[PDB]
Design a protein around this ligand. Structure first.
Ligand SMILES: [Mg+2]
Lengths: 681, 105
DNA sequence: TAGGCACTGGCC
DNA sequence: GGCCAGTGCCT
């Protein structure tokens, strides 16, 4: 086993030069440095470890180091270098699995200060290295009377850089040993720093192999990117911007600008007594000025055309135009129309969301109609922000290849669910919401033209069917012998639950259960029956009383955790520990964790089966993973025949997963073909 | 004797009043404003015939103050023939205001 | 007191 | 800068 790290001149996307690398070999216990002219030797040292069937440890190597080496070997040495997945270990991937209850800076992309809770020390040091090396470099120049620029710290190889590289390997090695010391994931009788790769994956907990495969596949997905229609979104922007301009014009005419106190320093004090008046707006007291300009020779002086008079206080003010985006301005204007706020924020301030704006009633006809214009204005700002003006807008992220390469943390949530960001492709407006069809239609394989034939690609949208309910059915099978599962795939589970609860409409059930599965609040539960927070708790109690199997399930899970805790985690399908924050949240955590893990093994197995059928993964091949949004994946395919094989293979893989984990409810998928995301979902 | 203006009566009450008119832009939530209010009552009462004092609450009549670039309140504008002769910001004193008028009247 | 991103406003 | 109260969009 060897531990390694490299320093290059840029991020994956534009990297072009290898600066240095360091290797620590466990079999010789020595550190070897490789400078730029040693790149070839560095690669040979890695391929040697692969020849021995050994392992290479990188921190965040699945997303950067491994792909970067392939790219740099081709560019600088015209050499083909491809490290096999089975020979690579990533301590960042391991950390996210074993320390899933903690957040991370994600290699310094997120500001430490914003993340809640504590952070793993070694991981924090590795993620802060770049920003640290950058500060050392700056002081270096700042001392030599030089000027700093962009990120010149990465343009050239130097000795400070090498020193940090050596430090990254000693820390990565420290993290590794700390991670391997966890008995739950790595049996104690085995020294994992002295085994070949096959023993390593086979003797460790199943979750270790699964997370590494997911990270490798997701890194490839980030590299593929999601084909994006820049022109379509620019034309959508123009349209939204015009509608915004017009809504603003109408609202600024209905609501006029006013004056607000601003720029006051001294406190206003009652001239009579002297009692300070903290409530009154701050004032200002000029020290210069008078009615007449100071004398400078009976004869009348020359008036002072100055506006202030020493000792004569005033309140500084600013002109403020109605901003439909300000909840304060909206709150200010609606009260001045007859609105009496009901709910306030737990910090002195009236709640003004779409929910309440929908129930606001004022006497003035035009003012009442403006509310609908305000709600429209807010939604338009939301869309404009996400697609064009926000810091993470789509138009700011599109790359030259015409694709958006969104980031994905394979294990960003405690339950094993993945998180998406930069930009978050998991929060694109759905087709059922305003402008959703146009937004969704801009993402799709049709926007990618085949590299050889110039023909657009086709898209396959594949979804796991009612995954959460089936997981629930699975877990209650030891209490009901599969009756709930039998009803889901044979009878009608929704009316079954409609009767279980005291709901008037079947659809009310489809909504009730869905809320029940992710653990919705009593309030939202009440809002389906019309009531609120009252009928809420009531229903949940009536439902369980007529569904004993779920109550038994909830009681046995609680027995597992509470005896004061007996253990503060639940075991996932793959054996990992899933932290449980609250006993009442145990069932939800269990269900959510099962779906996440099933979805993870499913997408992994689907790709492995496609590659075993002879299909090549990538735009230079036959198919490309573009998006994984929890229960669904969007796959680009070179042809319709391939899209049909993908859909069929996904079903096969889903069934393989149910069998693999002895699932007590049949699992299924549904696939749809089309040119883009709007049509494939 | 004090005239209470509105956005819509401004043009004719001030700009076309042929005579000296002292306008006071104020707001109910300003300390200094409530300070000079009593003063003005006295001035309008003393300069009856020679001058006319008028008040404009900037919260009920938001469209006029902007046209004159109000940056602080209470603001006093002396109009004469539809044009601004003099201007002064601040809670002047019964005496200070008296000098301001006599000198510009 | 579902779980994650991310936007705009208002402030020191 | 960062920092944060309030909200909405996706599963
Ligand atoms: Mg690195």
């Amino acid at each position: 086993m060897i531990v390694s790290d490299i320093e290059a001149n840029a991020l994956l996307e534009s990297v072009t030069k290898f600066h240095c690398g360091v290797i620590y070999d466990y079999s010789t216990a020595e550190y070897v440095s490789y400078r730029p002219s040693d790149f070839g030797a560095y690669l040979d040292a890695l391929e040697a470890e692969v020849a021995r069937g050994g392992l290479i440890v990188f921190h965040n190597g699945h997303k950067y180091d491994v792909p970067a080496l392939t790219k740099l070997a081709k560019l600088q040495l015209n050499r083909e270098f491809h490290l096999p997945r089975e020979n690579c270990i990533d301590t960042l991937v391991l950390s996210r699995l074993i320390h899933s209850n903690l957040k991370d800076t994600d290699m310094g992309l997120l500001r430490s200060g914003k993340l809640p809770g504590a952070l793993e020390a070694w991981g924090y040091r590795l993620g802060e290295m770049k920003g640290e090396y950058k500060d050392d470099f700056k002081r270096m120049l700042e001392e030599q009377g030089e000027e700093y620029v962009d990120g010149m710290e990465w343009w050239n190889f130097n000795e400070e850089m090498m020193d940090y590289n050596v430090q990254d390997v000693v820390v990565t090695k420290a993290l590794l040993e700390k991670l391997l010391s966890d008995k739950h994931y790595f049996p104690p009788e085995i020294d994992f720093t002295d085994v070949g790769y096959t023993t390593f994956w086979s003797e460790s907990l199943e979750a270790v192999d699964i997370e590494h495969r997911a990270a490798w596949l997701l890194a490839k997905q980030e590299r593929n990117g999601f084909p994006f229609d820049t022109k379509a979104i620019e034309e959508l922007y123009v349209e939204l911007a015009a509608r915004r301009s017009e809504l603003l014009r109408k609202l600024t005419e209905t609501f006029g600008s006013w004056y607000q106190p601003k720029g006051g320093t001294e406190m206003f004090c009652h001239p009579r007594t002297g009692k300070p008046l903290p409530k009154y707006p701050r004032i200002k007291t000029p020290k210069v000025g008078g009615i007449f300009k100071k004398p400078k020779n009976r004869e009348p002086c020359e008036l002072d055309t100055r506006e202030y008079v020493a000792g004569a206080p005033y309140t500084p003010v600013e002109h403020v135009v109605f901003n439909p985006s300000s909840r304060d301005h909206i709150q200010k204007k609606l009260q001045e129309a007859g609105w009496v706020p009901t709910k306030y924020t737990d910090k002195g301030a009236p709640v003004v969301d779409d929910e309440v704006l929908e129930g606001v009633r004022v006497d003035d006809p035009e003012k009442q109609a403006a509310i609908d214009l305000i709600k429209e204005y807010l939604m338009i700002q939301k869309r404009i922000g996400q697609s064009a003006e926000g810091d993470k807008a789509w138009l700011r992220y599109v790359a030259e290849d015409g694709k958006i390469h969104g980031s994905v943390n394979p294990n960003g949530a405690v339950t094993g669910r993945a998180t998406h960001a930069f930009p978050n492709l998991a929060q694109i407006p759905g087709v059922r919401s305003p402008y959703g069809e146009q937004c969704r239609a801009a993402f799709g394989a049709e926007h990618h033209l085949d590299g050889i034939t110039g023909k657009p690609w086709v898209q396959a949208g594949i979804d796991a069917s009612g995954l959460e309910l089936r997981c629930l059915a699975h877990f209650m099978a030891r209490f009901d012998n599969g009756e709930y599962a039998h009803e889901i795939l044979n009878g009608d589970i929704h009316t079954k639950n409609q009767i279980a609860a005291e709901l008037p409409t079947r659809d009310n059930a489809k909504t009730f259960i869905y809320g029940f599965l992710y653990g919705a609040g009593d309030e939202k539960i009440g809002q389906i029956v019309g009531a609120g927070k009252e009928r809420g708790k009531e229903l949940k109690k009536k439902f369980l009383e007529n569904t004993p199997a779920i109550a038994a399930l909830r009681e046995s899970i609680q027995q597992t955790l509470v005896e004061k805790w007996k253990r503060r985690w639940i075991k996932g399908l793959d054996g990992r520990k899933v932290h449980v924050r609250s006993p009442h949240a145990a069932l939800n955590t269990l269900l959510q964790s099962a779906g996440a893990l099933i979805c993870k093994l499913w997408i992994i197995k689907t790709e492995e089966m496609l590659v075993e059928k002879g299909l090549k993964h990538g735009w230079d091949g036959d198919f490309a993973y573009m998006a994984w949004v929890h229960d669904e994946i969007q796959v680009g395919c070179r042809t319709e025949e391939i899209a049909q094989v993908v859909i069929e293979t996904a079903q096969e893989a889903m069934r393989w997963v149910g069998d693999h984990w002895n699932f007590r409810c049949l699992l299924d998928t549904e696939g749809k073909m089309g040119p883009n995301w709007a049509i494939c979902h | 004797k004090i005239i209470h203006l509105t956005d819509d009566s401004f043009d004719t009450d001030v700009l076309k009043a042929d005579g000296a008119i002292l306008v006071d832009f104020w707001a109910e939530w300003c300390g200094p404003c409530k300070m000079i209010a009593p003063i003005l009552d006295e001035i309008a009462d003393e300069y009856q015939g020679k001058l006319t004092v008028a008040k404009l609450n900037i919260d009920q009549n938001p469209g006029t103050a902007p046209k004159y670039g109000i940056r602080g309140i209470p603001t006093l504008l002396l109009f004469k023939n539809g044009e601004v002769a003099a201007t002064k910001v601040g809670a002047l004193s019964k005496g200070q205001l008296k000098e301001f008028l006599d000198a510009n009247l």
